[PDB]
mmCIF file of C-alpha atoms in Angstrom:
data_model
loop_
_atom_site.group_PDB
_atom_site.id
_atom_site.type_symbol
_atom_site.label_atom_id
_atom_site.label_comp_id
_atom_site.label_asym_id
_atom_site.label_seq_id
_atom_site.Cartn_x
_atom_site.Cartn_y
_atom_site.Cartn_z
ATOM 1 C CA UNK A 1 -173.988 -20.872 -125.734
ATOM 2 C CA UNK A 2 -171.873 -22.935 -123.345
ATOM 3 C CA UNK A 3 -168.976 -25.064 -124.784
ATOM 4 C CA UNK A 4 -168.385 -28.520 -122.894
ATOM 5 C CA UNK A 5 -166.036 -27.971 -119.839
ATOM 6 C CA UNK A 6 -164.279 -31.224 -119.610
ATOM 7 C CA UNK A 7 -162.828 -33.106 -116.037
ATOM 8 C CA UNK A 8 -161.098 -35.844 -115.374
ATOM 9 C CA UNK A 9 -162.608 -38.674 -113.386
ATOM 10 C CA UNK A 10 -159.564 -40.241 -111.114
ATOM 11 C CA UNK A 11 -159.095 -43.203 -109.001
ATOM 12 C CA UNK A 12 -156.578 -43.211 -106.075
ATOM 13 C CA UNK A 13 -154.687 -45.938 -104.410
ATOM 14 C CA UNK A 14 -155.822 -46.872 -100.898
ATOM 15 C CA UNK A 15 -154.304 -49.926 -99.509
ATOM 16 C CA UNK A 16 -157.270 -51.411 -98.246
ATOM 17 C CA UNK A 17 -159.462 -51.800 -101.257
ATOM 18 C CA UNK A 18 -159.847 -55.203 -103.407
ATOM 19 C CA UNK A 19 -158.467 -54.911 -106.825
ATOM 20 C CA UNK A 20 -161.297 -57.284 -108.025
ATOM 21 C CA UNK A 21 -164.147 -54.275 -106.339
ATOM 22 C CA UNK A 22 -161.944 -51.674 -108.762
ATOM 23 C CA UNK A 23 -162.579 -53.273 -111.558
ATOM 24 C CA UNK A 24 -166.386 -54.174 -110.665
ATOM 25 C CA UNK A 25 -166.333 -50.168 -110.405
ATOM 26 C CA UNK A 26 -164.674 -49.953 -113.881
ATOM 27 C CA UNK A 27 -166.988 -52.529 -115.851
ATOM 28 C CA UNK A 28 -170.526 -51.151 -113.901
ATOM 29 C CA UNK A 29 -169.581 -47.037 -114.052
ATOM 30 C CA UNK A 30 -167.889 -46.779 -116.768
ATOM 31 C CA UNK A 31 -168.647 -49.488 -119.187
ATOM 32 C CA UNK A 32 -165.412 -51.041 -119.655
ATOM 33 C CA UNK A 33 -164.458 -54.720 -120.950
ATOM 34 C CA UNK A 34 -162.948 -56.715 -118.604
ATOM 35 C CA UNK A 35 -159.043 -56.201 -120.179
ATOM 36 C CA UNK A 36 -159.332 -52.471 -120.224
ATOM 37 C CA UNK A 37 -160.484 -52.570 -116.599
ATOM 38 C CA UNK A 38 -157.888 -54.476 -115.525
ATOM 39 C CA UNK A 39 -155.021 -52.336 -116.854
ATOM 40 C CA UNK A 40 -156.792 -48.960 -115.225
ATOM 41 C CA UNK A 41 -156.815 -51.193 -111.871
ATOM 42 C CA UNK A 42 -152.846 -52.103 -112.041
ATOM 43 C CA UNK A 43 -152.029 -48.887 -113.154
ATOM 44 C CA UNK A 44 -154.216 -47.382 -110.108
ATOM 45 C CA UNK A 45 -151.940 -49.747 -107.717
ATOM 46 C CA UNK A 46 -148.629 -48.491 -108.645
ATOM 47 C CA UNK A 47 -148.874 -45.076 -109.892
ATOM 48 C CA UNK A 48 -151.280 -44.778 -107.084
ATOM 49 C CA UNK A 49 -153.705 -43.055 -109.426
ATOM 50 C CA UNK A 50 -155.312 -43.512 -113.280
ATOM 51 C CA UNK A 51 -157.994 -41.702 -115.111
ATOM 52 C CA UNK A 52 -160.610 -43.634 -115.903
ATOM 53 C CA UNK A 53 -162.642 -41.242 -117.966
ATOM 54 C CA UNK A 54 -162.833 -37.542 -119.706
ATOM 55 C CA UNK A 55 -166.436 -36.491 -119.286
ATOM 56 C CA UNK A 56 -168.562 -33.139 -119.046
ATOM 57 C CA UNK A 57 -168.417 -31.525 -115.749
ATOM 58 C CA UNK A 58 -172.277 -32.483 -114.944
ATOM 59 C CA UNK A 59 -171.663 -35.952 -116.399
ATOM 60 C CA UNK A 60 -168.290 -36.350 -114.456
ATOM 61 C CA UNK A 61 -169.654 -35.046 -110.905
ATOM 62 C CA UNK A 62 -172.615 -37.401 -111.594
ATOM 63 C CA UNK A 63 -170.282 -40.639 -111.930
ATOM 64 C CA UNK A 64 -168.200 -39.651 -109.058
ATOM 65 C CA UNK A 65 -171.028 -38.993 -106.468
ATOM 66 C CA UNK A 66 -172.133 -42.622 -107.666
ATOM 67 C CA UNK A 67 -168.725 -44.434 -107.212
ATOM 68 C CA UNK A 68 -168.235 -42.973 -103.779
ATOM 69 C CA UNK A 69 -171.854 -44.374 -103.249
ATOM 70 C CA UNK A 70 -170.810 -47.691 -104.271
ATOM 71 C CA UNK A 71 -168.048 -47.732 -102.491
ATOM 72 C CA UNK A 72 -169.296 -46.852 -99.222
ATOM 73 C CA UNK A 73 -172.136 -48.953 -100.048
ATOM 74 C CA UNK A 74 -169.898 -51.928 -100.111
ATOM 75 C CA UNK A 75 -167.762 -50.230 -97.374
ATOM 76 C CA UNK A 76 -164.582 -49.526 -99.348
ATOM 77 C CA UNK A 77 -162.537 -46.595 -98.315
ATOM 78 C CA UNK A 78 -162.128 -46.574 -102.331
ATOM 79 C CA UNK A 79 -161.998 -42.734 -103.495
ATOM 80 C CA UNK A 80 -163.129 -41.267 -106.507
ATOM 81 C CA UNK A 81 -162.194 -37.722 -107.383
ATOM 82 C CA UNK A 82 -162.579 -34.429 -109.972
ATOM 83 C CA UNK A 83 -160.009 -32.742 -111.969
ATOM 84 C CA UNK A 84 -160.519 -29.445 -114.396
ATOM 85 C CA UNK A 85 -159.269 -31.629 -117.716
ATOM 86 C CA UNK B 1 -207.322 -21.135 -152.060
ATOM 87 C CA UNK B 2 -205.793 -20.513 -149.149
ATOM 88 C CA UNK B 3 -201.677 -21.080 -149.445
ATOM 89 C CA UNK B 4 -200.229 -22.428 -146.265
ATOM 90 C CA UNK B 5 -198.883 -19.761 -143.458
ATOM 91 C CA UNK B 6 -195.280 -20.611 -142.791
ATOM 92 C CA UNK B 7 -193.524 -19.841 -139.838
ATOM 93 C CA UNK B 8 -189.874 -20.009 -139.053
ATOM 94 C CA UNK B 9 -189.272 -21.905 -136.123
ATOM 95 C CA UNK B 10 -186.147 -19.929 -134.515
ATOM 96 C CA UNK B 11 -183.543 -20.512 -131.632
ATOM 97 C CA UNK B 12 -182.262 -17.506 -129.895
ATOM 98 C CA UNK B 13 -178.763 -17.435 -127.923
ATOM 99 C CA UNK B 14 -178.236 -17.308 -124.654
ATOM 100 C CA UNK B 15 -174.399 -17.867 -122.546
ATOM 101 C CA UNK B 16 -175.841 -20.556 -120.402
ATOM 102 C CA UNK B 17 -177.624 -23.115 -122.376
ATOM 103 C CA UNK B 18 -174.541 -26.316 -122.982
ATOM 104 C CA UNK B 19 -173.873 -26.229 -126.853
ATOM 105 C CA UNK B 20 -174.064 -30.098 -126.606
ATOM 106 C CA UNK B 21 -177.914 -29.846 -124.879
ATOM 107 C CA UNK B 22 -178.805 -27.829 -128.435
ATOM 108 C CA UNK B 23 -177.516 -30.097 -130.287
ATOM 109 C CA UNK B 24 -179.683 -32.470 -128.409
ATOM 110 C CA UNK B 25 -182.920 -30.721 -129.504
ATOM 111 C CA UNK B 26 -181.648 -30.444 -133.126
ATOM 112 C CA UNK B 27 -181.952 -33.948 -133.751
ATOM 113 C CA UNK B 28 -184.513 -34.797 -131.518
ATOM 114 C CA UNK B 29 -187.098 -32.421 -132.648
ATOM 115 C CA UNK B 30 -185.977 -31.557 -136.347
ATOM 116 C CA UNK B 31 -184.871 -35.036 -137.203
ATOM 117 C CA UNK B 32 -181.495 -33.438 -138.176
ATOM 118 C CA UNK B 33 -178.116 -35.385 -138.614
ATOM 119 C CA UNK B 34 -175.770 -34.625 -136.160
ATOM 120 C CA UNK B 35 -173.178 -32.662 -139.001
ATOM 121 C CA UNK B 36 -176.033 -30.747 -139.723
ATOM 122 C CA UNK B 37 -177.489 -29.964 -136.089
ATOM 123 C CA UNK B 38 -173.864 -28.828 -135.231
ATOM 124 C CA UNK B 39 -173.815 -25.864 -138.200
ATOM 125 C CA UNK B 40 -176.855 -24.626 -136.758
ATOM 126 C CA UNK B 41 -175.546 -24.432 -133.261
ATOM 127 C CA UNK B 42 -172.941 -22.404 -134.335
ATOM 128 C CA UNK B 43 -175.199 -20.454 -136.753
ATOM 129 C CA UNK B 44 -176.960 -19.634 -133.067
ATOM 130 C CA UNK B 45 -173.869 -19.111 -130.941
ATOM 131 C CA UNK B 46 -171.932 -16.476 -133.103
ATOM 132 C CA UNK B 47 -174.603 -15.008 -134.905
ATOM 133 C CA UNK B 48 -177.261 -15.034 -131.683
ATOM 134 C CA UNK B 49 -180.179 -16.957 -133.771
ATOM 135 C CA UNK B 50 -180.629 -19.401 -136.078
ATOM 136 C CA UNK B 51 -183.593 -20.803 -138.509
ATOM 137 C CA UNK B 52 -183.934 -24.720 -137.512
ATOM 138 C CA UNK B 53 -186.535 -25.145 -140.197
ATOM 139 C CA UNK B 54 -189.792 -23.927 -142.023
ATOM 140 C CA UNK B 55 -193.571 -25.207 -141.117
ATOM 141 C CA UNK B 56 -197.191 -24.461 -141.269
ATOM 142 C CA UNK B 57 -198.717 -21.963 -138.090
ATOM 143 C CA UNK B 58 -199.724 -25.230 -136.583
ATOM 144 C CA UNK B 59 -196.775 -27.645 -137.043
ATOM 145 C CA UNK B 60 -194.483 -24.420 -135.944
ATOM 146 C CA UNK B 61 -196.804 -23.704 -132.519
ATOM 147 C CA UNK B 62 -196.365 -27.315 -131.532
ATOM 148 C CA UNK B 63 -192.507 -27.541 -131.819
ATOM 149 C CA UNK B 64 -192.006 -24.275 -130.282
ATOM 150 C CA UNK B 65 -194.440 -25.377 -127.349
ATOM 151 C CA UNK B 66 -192.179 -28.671 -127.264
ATOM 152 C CA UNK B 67 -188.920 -26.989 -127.215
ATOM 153 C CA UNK B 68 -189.050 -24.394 -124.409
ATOM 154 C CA UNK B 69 -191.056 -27.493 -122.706
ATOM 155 C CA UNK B 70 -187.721 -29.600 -123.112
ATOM 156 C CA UNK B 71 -185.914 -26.853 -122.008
ATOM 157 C CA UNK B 72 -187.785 -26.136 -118.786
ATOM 158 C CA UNK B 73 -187.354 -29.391 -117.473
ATOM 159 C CA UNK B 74 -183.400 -29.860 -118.572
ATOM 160 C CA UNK B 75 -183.372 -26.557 -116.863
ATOM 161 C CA UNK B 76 -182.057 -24.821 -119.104
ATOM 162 C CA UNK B 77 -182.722 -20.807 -120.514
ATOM 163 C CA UNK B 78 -182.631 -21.640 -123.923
ATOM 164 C CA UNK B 79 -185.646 -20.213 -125.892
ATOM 165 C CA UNK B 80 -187.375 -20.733 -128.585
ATOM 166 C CA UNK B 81 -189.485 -18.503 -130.807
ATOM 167 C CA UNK B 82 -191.733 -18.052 -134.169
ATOM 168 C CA UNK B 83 -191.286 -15.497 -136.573
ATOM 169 C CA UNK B 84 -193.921 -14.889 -139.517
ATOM 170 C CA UNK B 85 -192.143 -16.006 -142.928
#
């Protein structure tokens, strides 16, 4: 069989993004409480990048495709991006 | 009188199928706990099969059938066989 391949599901700074649309993002995608969002959101502002999840690869290309949906949806240059784990 | 005709309801191994999808079909077809369901994925993965349970010719068509059905749409190889007991 296959063992799980994990990735890392990342959030980068942009300057022009709301901090209140991260943590929408956080709460709707990734099923966070409020507090837990918010501390993902600061830390994406000044380290200019936080992991918001660990999934499987399918799962984690799935919830970034969607993200970058929302985001343009909404038209936020907000980016979501993969990592090998 | 006629004794039942058991059938063992096997999985057979395969490098592509996730180890978490067969886990999946443990417990969803052979009511299996999730300790349990994990043994017998590894039962499959090392030793290249593994018997997920006993049942009558009929009982042990239908699962199969269900299985490989399950499979097929998850898109996945994994097969799944009878063997006379």
């Amino acid at each position: 069989l296959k063992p799980p391949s994990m990735y890392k599901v990342i959030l980068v700074n942009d300057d022009y993004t709301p901090m209140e649309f991260v943590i929408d993002v956080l709460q709707k995608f990734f099923s966070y409480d409020v507090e837990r969002a918010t501390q993902l959101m600061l830390a994406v502002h000044y380290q200019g990048k936080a992991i918001c999840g660990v999934f499987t690869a399918e799962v984690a290309e799935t919830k970034v495709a969607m993200v970058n949906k929302y985001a343009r949806e909404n038209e936020h240059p907000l980016l979501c991006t993969l990592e090998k784990a």
